[PDB]
Design an enzyme around this catalytic site. Structure first.
Site, short mmCIF file in Angstrom:
data_model
loop_
_atom_site.label_atom_id
_atom_site.label_comp_id
_atom_site.label_asym_id
_atom_site.label_seq_id
_atom_site.Cartn_x
_atom_site.Cartn_y
_atom_site.Cartn_z
N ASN A 133 -7.80 -8.45 -1.72
CA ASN A 133 -9.19 -7.86 -1.83
C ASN A 133 -10.28 -8.83 -2.06
O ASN A 133 -11.28 -8.04 -2.44
CB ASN A 133 -8.90 -6.92 -2.73
CG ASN A 133 -7.97 -5.53 -2.40
OD1 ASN A 133 -7.49 -5.55 -1.13
ND2 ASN A 133 -7.29 -4.74 -3.32
N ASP B 175 -11.33 -2.90 -0.21
CA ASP B 175 -10.58 -1.77 -0.37
C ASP B 175 -10.45 -1.05 -1.70
O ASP B 175 -9.77 -1.63 -2.70
CB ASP B 175 -9.09 -2.53 -0.14
CG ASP B 175 -7.90 -1.51 -0.05
OD1 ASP B 175 -8.22 -0.33 -0.06
OD2 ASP B 175 -6.86 -1.89 0.37
N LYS C 167 -7.00 -8.24 -6.47
CA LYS C 167 -5.98 -9.23 -6.45
C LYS C 167 -6.52 -9.88 -5.14
O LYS C 167 -7.57 -9.76 -4.65
CB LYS C 167 -4.65 -8.38 -5.85
CG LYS C 167 -5.05 -7.64 -4.62
CD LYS C 167 -3.67 -6.79 -4.36
CE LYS C 167 -3.65 -5.64 -3.45
NZ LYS C 167 -2.54 -4.94 -3.40
N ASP D 98 -7.17 -2.57 -8.68
CA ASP D 98 -6.27 -3.30 -7.67
C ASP D 98 -6.93 -4.48 -7.30
O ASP D 98 -6.63 -5.11 -6.17
CB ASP D 98 -5.88 -2.67 -6.42
CG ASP D 98 -4.53 -3.00 -5.82
OD1 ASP D 98 -3.87 -3.66 -6.52
OD2 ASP D 98 -4.20 -2.86 -4.67
N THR E 47 -1.01 -3.99 -8.76
CA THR E 47 -0.07 -4.95 -8.21
C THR E 47 0.76 -5.75 -9.36
O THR E 47 0.10 -6.01 -10.14
CB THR E 47 -0.79 -5.83 -7.30
OG1 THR E 47 -1.37 -5.02 -6.36
CG2 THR E 47 0.07 -6.95 -6.79
#
Lengths: 215, 223
Positions: A132, A148, A129, A127, A168
């Site tokens: 983060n 995260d 992105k 994840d 995502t």
């Protein structure tokens, strides 16, 4: 927790968790304490938090938010993270008066250093992105820190497998969208999407219709 | 077959039929109705109006024997009432849809969300009693039942798929409709059964059959 540390202002609060600025009085430190009301934590949420803590304990790197301690009390578990004050990398960039490829390359170098550390420890973030990618502090040259690991998985060496449809949309890899077994390379695709955005400020894949986006 | 005009004159029986009789059949079984012989024209066809010189006068015992069977089947199949028979002789393509459907149901029963998100399209839509007449989109609505009930509850359940019907709507699309019978243990530990009717639309994407939409009526799948 109060045993050793000392709590202060609130930095956030979720459904089962409240985060506050903290300080290790014995050593004059300053951390971020994730205070979990264990009485509100479900069974499936209990399974995911056990995974996130185990992974965070395993990753010790400058560009990764470090988990410093885990300790329990009366239905209240404490997770001591690094204190991150600089906010989102992407939000800092828009505030800068000068920004070039060299700045973007310095950022991606740190992001790659964290991703490489994760992969070297058999961990895939899944994840990556902008939300983060945080800055350790508001200092002029603060370090980029990966954050995260709530979607992070533990992989066996270089073995591919289907770990589920997670991530995502704008950063999902072709292999996940094809429903193929996948692994560490999904993070490098996300890095490529982030690098594209860091250079021109808009995503390489965008469409109102998610189906078209995935195509 | 009819729309393609896919008939022929197989040997041996047709080897002894005159060319003129085959010709008249061809002109009647012309796919394009604009080019099909009319009743007035057929009445002037040599096989009709010059029968004495054109039509064979050989005995066709094999036609009589076959007509006997044709007539017998026709009188047996004479449906006095509307009769609806299930499907039981499935092509390999249709069995493929049944298999992936049962793999999906199995993943639900076992609370395997990874398999569910592998088989279901990310843009899946659904009508189901759990959704109270709303069309739901994505995996969110269904994630709740995996993260909680589907694995939390420890009771035995047995699923039965009754009378599946598969429509092939192109090389990479299919539709399946079936009755879903579920036997389970209720709160008091007593055996119960519930029924749902379910439609699942399948699209072959990236070489994998994937569920893009489903519609459940009747009982909700969670006991």
């Amino acid at each position: 927790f109060t045993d050793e540390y000392q709590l202060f202002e609130e930095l956030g609060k979720g459904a089962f968790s409240v985060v506050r600025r903290c300080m290790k009085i014995p050593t004059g430190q300053e951390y971020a304490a994730k205070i979990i009301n264990t009485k509100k934590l479900s069974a499936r949420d209990h399974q995911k938090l056990e995974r996130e803590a185990r992974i965070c304990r395993l990753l010790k790197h400058p560009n990764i938010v470090r988990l410093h301690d885990s300790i329990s009390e009366e239905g209240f578990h404490y997770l001591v993270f690094d204190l991150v004050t600089g906010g989102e990398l992407f939000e800092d960039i828009v505030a800068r008066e000068y920004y070039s490829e060299a700045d973007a390359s310095h950022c991606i170098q740190q992001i790659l250093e964290s991703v490489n550390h994760c992969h070297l420890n058999g961990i895939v973030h899944r994840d990556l992105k902008p939300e983060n990618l945080l800055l350790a502090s508001k200092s002029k040259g603060a370090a980029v820190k990966l954050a995260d690991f709530g979607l992070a998985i533990e992989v066996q060496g270089d073995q591919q497998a289907w770990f589920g449809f997670a991530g995502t949309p704008g950063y999902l890899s072709p292999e996940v969208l094809r429903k193929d077994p996948y692994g560490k390379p999904v993070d490098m695709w996300a890095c490529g999407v982030i690098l594209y955005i860091l250079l021109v400020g808009y995503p390489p894949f965008w469409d109102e219709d998610q189906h078209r986006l995935y195509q | 077959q009819i729309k393609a005009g896919a008939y022929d004159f197989p040997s041996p029986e047709w080897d002894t039929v005159t060319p003129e009789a085959k010709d008249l059949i061809n002109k009647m079984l012309t796919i394009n109705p604009a080019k099909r012989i009319t009743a007035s024209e057929a009445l002037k066809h040599p096989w009709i109006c010059q029968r004495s010189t054109v039509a064979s006068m050989m005995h066709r015992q094999e036609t009589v024997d076959c007509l006997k069977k044709f007539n017998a089947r026709r009188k047996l199949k004479g449906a006095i009432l509307t009769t609806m028979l299930a499907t039981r002789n499935f092509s390999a393509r249709k069995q493929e849809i049944i298999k992936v459907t049962e793999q999906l149901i199995e993943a639900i029963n076992n609370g395997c969300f990874e398999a569910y998100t592998k088989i279901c399209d990310p843009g899946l839509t659904a009508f189901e009693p759990e959704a109270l007449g709303n069309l739901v989109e994505g995996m969110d609505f269904h994630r709740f039942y995996f993260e909680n009930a589907l694995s939390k509850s420890n009771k035995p359940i047995h699923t039965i798929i009754l009378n599946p019907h598969v429509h092939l709507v192109g090389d990479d699309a299919a539709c399946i409709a079936y009755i879903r019978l579920t036997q389970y243990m209720d709160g008091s530990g007593m055996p119960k059964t519930m029924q749902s009717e379910e439609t699942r639309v399948w699209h072959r994407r990236d070489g994998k059959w994937q569920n893009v939409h489903f519609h459940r009526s009747g009982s909700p799948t969670v006991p």
